[PDB]
């Protein structure tokens, strides 16, 4: 279904705050921000989709994503909070794209 202004603002906000949270998690863990984003995305989407990303320096298989998810789950409460932030941001990203898929059609029909 099509979003209401409130749902749109809420999803966009969660997306922005999740990107900020991935930045903060890279600050803390000293890991790579892109690898962190890929791990959060992998868990949000499920094991249905897991593949090697071109920019990543490591091959993204369920073993390494479990390792990184464990290094994330072993954080203090005020640190591990950013993990939940990022997860909810990714879920909002997916639902925002899916909610606005109709606009693409209504534009592309004229090309």
């Amino acid at each position: 279904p099509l979003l209401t202004l409130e749902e749109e603002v809420e999803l966009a906000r969660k997306v922005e705050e999740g990107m900020e949270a991935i930045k903060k998690l890279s600050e803390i863990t000293g890991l790579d921000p892109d690898l962190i984003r890929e791990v959060v995305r992998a868990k949000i989407l499920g094991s249905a989709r897991v593949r090697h990303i071109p920019g990543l320096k490591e091959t993204l298989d369920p073993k390494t994503v479990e390792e990184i998810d464990q290094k994330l789950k072993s954080l203090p409460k005020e640190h591990k909070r950013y993990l939940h932030i990022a997860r909810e941001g990714e879920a909002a990203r997916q639902h925002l794209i899916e909610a606005n898929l109709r606009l693409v059609v209504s534009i592309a029909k004229k090309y």
């Binding site: 209401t4 202004l5 409130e6 749902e7 603002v9 809420e10 906000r13």
Partner: protein, 226 residues
């Protein structure tokens, strides 16, 4: 939810299929209802103060404390509760019942309490001299539903008693939330002075809790049954 109408169910509360969720909504399934973007945030701010009252000794109903609605005294004839200080009247009417506060220069000199059954005979800001009627108590009088008497201290003087009540009650203040604002506080949580309730785009539209109180969410944009 249509505009302005409120929810007949509460946030976090489990529901049943067919159970109506609002005056125009009936949930098709069972489970945990959830609020989507509450538009009005009401905070019940708590207040622990000290207020006095003088009554005939015959009408009094002696107790160590008073639960809400409980009878405080029963009067055979109309009685005039008179001022025992001189000042300007700060009238503060609750849902039912009121508080009178007297202040001389600016500092309060008397804080009275008029439970249900006492019609105040004064207007906010009025000047009162010592001994003039602040309220008439007619017949039985009882505590309001919104305020409770934690402790009671009495003093016998002549044919009257003077009660120094240790009162505790809550006062509501509403806040209007806009679609660009999000509630960062759950239902029924406790805030302090300085805690944030509703964030916004710019800091000057945020909702900060002035004092301590209990948060209540009303008028959600929609209700999500999961």
């Amino acid at each position: 939810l249509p505009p302005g109408v409120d929810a007949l169910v509460k946030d976090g509360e489990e529901v049943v299929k067919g159970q109506e969720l609002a005056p125009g909504v009936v949930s098709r399934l069972d489970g945990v209802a959830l609020y989507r973007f509450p538009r009005r945030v009401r905070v019940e701010y708590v207040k622990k103060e000290r207020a006095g009252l003088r009554l005939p000794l015959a009408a009094w109903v002696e107790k160590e404390a008073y639960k809400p609605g409980e009878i405080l005294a029963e009067l055979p004839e109309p009685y005039l509760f008179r001022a025992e200080e001189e000042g300007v009247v700060e009238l503060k009417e609750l849902e039912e019942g009121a508080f009178l506060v007297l202040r001389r220069e600016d500092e309060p000199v008397a804080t009275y309490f008029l439970p249900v059954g006492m019609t105040p005979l004064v207007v906010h800001g009025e000047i009162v001299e010592k001994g003039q009627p602040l309220a008439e108590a007619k017949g039985l009088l009882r505590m309001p539903r919104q305020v409770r008497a934690a402790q009671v201290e009495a003093e016998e003087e002549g044919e009257t008693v003077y009660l120094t009540l240790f009162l505790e009650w809550t006062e509501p203040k509403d806040y209007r939330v806009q679609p660009h604002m999000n509630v960062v506080v759950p239902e029924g949580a406790r805030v302090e002075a300085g805690d944030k309730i509703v964030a916004a785009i710019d800091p000057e539209e945020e909702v900060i809790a002035e004092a301590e109180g209990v948060v209540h969410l009303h008028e959600p944009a929609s209700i999500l049954v999961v």
